[PDB]
Enzyme design. Structure first.
Site, short mmCIF file in Angstrom:
data_model
loop_
_atom_site.label_atom_id
_atom_site.label_comp_id
_atom_site.label_asym_id
_atom_site.label_seq_id
_atom_site.Cartn_x
_atom_site.Cartn_y
_atom_site.Cartn_z
N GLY A 221 0.78 -1.24 0.00
CA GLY A 221 0.00 0.00 0.00
C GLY A 221 0.81 1.28 0.00
O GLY A 221 1.79 1.41 -0.73
N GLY A 222 0.39 2.24 0.82
CA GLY A 222 1.08 3.51 0.94
C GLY A 222 2.37 3.36 1.73
O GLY A 222 3.23 4.24 1.74
N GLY B 38 26.87 16.76 -25.50
CA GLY B 38 26.20 16.99 -24.23
C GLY B 38 26.71 16.06 -23.15
O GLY B 38 26.82 16.44 -21.98
N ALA B 39 27.04 14.84 -23.55
CA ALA B 39 27.50 13.79 -22.65
C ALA B 39 28.78 14.18 -21.91
O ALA B 39 28.89 13.98 -20.70
CB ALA B 39 27.70 12.52 -23.42
#
Lengths: 353, 168, 176, 176
Positions: free
Chosen positions: A5-6, A242-243
């Site tokens: 669940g949570g 960019g790398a």
């Protein structure tokens, strides 16, 4: 065991999550409720078993074959970390062999000659770390990049490194998130980061873009720039576009950047570069493409696909024999041990989530 | 070769040889002759044997005006880096009269800013070894910029890390 | 989307009003396999990290974890208001007893369909209300929907002056 | 004189506007034996140490060290402006070509002038402007003189909110 669940979100916020093969599971949504609504069914093993969360979901850092192993992997993890963010990681000081060793010398041939030929980054890392010992996090998730801890002269350090063996060592979204968060973990707890870079660029893919690699790979950049721990990066081979910046470059604030003579620091690879450049020359006098294009792609490779243009500008602190890496890391960590920086007050930054 | 890793390795060593000897053997003799040492050498004597780690060893200028473009010696008239003195961390730069009369260029000033920033950041002393004919006029305002970037580092560092100027 | 918006606001001293009508989390193995565990933790983190005025109004449903995700008192929200139409519970009426009254399945074999259909509304007629949460003061008050603006106005007035501390860190380690 | 006025302004949050017409330093053996080295260095320290708004206008000559001494950007000045009457170079014209091409002035150097004076003028027209500086951003703009007041006005308005830091020191160690 089951974290249902949570409840799932608690471990999510902790720095490290460790789980065992068949006797642990986490999920916000059980599979009965899943079938009732989406129409699909599955078992607990493949929904949120240990394996799935270590290779697929990115939520777990280690998959132990056994609880005793798992309890052992937590102990290791602690050993690389301080008790809180007000101390350095615990050191077991030892003196480094400051001369060149036979192990060191192995690095001078680790790099194959064919760019398409991949070598094993684990090796380069083990040659740098005390006792060739590399404690690795998330080895199953985004195998294309490597993260984990080790020691240099007895002081915990962290590692980030492109792994050629897996998908050409390309950056992708999962690699970025894996690494981004590991860097920020080390930063927060005062462990130096060492980066080993062989990186062609970003995994081409429309699935990649259509889930904003843009705001995903940006996380890694942020982590390095935000960091104040010692940063030493070593470029073993490829640093393209960019790398290059992404992987712990100087521009992002790295303290010591070093390149092997096998490094290629350029805006893009040779082929893609000349198709753009002097595209005039290739088309005209145009027997076929190859003729002039090939001579151009290698006129280009030999001229710029070195680390040396970078080096004349100081982008890279030195170009070194690879067998000198360990000794460079050693001496650098020593001087960087007292690194202190600053910055304008903020409640916090606004990292691209 | 050079399309092999090993050819690259050996390529790096020629580089080292050339940077290690930026000046002509003649200006080397001529500095010796005045009874003084080379830029390197002044460092060697200063730092604990074995500790010197050089920064920007292969840096080269970008000045095109006049005939500087013709000659771009590794380093750029200045030797810089970090090491230890008596086991304690220190940052050093040493000016190479052997190069452009040791005239301060723009890259040459960038190298100096880099060690000054390094020391300030790690909290060690800076030892500056000064041996220069003045501003490298050929590069114009650029040299004046370099000077400025240093004066400001000197001021910010003042009373933070020791700075010693060895003027020889 | 939300997690980064809350941080932007918190970063720049902008108060955050949150309105919650949330059944729970989208079901799907695709939701999990892509990391909902760690991606949805971002909203919890943003709210808990926040130090700006947080005012939360529950208009209708808030179940289980999603209840916490949306500006609950537990994460640090200063004012929580619930309309009379707010159902604040661990999970839906059906899900609830479909486990907690398990022993009535083949029990009363045929009349089972009718044994549990009533237990569904026997509980939401006493559970799916803001009022359990009310007695514990998990919500600061239950109020007419017509009063929310006035409530929001008055709270922000008082809340404009809020400050508080916590232990120093370079930064946090938000799931990523 | 200027060193201490500048520091006085700095301590008391008073912005400093600098106007620059500097050929260089007063040539004199006395000036040296009197310590110009450790005395003129003070002005440099004042400007670099300052955190008030600094707006420097070059009306004309900015030569050599004196360029920097006078509120240059490199010392941290926030806005540096040049008139087209500004001359920002390492040294005056004749001093420059003197060193630059002796070979030419002395080879085929029967006519020693007409080359020397031609090499100058050529140097002047080419470099004793503010535009090389402008190319590198050392100077924020080159402006009509008539726009000075309007530049200072808008600049102060914007610089009113300026803040900077630095590593703790008890105090600095200015040359005395």
């Amino acid at each position: 065991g089951p974290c249902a669940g949570g409840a799932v979100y608690s471990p999510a916020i902790t720095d490290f999550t460790v789980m065992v093969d068949q006797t642990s599971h986490m999920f916000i949504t059980g599979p009965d409720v899943i079938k009732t609504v989406t129409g699909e069914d599955v078992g607990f093993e493949e929904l949120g078993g240990a394996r799935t969360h270590n290779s697929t979901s990115g939520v777990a850092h280690h998959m132990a074959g056994d609880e005793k192993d798992a309890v052992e992997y937590v102990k290791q993890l602690l050993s690389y970390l301080p008790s809180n963010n007000l101390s350095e990681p615990p050191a077991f000081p030892e003196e480094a062999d400051l001369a060149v060793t036979d192990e060191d010398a192995e690095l001078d041939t680790i790099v194959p000659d064919s760019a398409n030929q991949p070598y094993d980054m684990h090796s380069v890392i083990e040659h740098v770390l005390d006792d060739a010992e590399f404690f690795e996090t998330q080895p199953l998730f985004a195998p294309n990049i490597l993260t984990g801890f080790g020691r240099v002269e007895g002081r915990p350090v962290g590692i980030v490194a492109n792994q050629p063996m897996q998908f050409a060592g390309c950056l992708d979204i999962t690699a970025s998130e894996k690494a981004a968060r590991f860097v920020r973990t080390c930063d927060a707890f005062n462990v130096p980061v060492l980066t080993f870079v062989d990186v062609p660029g970003f995994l081409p893919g429309v699935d990649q873009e259509h889930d904003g690699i843009i705001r995903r790979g940006a996380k890694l950049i942020f982590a390095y720039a935000e960091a104040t721990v010692p940063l030493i990066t070593v470029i073993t081979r490829k640093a393209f576009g960019g790398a290059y910046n992404v992987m712990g470059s100087k521009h992002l604030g790295a303290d010591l950047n070093l390149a092997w003579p096998t490094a290629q620091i350029a805006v893009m690879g040779a082929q893609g570069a000349v198709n753009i450049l002097h595209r005039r020359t290739i088309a005209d006098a145009g027997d076929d493409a190859e003729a002039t294009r090939a001579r151009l792609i290698q006129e280009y490779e030999d001229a710029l696909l070195n680390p040396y243009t970078a080096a004349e500008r100081g982008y890279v602190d030195a170009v070194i024999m690879p067998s000198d890496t360990r000794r460079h890391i050693v001496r650098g960590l020593r001087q960087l041990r007292t690194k202190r920086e600053s910055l304008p007050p903020k409640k916090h930054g606004n990292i691209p989530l | 070769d050079i399309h092999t890793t090993a050819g690259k390795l050996a390529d790096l060593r020629r580089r080292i040889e050339e940077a290690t000897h930026a000046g002509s053997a003649r200006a080397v003799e001529k500095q010796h002759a005045k009874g003084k040492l080379t830029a390197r050498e002044r460092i060697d004597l200063l730092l604990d044997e074995g500790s010197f780690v050089e920064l920007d060893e292969f840096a080269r200028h970008r000045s095109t005006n006049f005939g500087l473009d013709a000659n771009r010696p590794y380093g750029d008239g200045v030797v810089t880096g970090y090491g230890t003195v008596d086991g304690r961390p220190v940052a050093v730069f040493s000016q190479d009269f052997t190069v452009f009369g040791g005239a301060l260029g723009e890259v040459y000033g960038q190298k100096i800013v880099k060690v000054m920033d390094f020391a300030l950041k790690t909290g060690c002393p800076v030892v500056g070894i000064n041996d220069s004919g003045g501003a490298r006029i050929q590069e114009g305002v650029a040299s004046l910029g370099a000077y400025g970037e240093i004066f400001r580092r000197n001021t910010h560092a003042s009373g933070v890390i020791p700075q010693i100027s060895l003027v020889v």
